[PDB]
């Protein structure tokens, strides 16, 4: 996948977290991308390996 710059690989899944309405993606402790927001529909999706 590529989300307007974020390049990665994995399974995408519907989320149930709530970003603040200016945050694009979420990170874990140890700093790995684990959630994104879809630019077009603006919904949060988790990224599992």
């Amino acid at each position: 996948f590529n989300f307007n710059g974020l390049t990665g690989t994995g399974v995408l899944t519907e989320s149930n977290k709530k970003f603040l309405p200016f945050q694009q993606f979420g990170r874990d402790i140890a700093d790995t991308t684990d959630a994104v927001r879809d630019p077009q529909t603006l919904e949060i999706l988790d990224i599992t390996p």
Binding site: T7, I29, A30, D31, T32
Partner: protein, 45 residues
């Protein structure tokens, strides 16, 4: 025997230490995947 139960219910530092050391090392291992070591970035892409 009734007082052991109070003193614990209210001390396992040697067991907590082992756990903490291993987690602190595993986190340092992953946090190194974002250093350059003298390169232009940290990403192969």
């Amino acid at each position: 025997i009734g007082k052991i139960q109070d003193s614990l219910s209210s001390a396992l530092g040697k067991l907590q230490d082992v756990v903490n050391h291993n987690a602190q090392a595993l986190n340092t291992l992953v946090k190194q995947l974002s250093s350059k070591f003298g390169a232009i970035s940290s990403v192969l892409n």
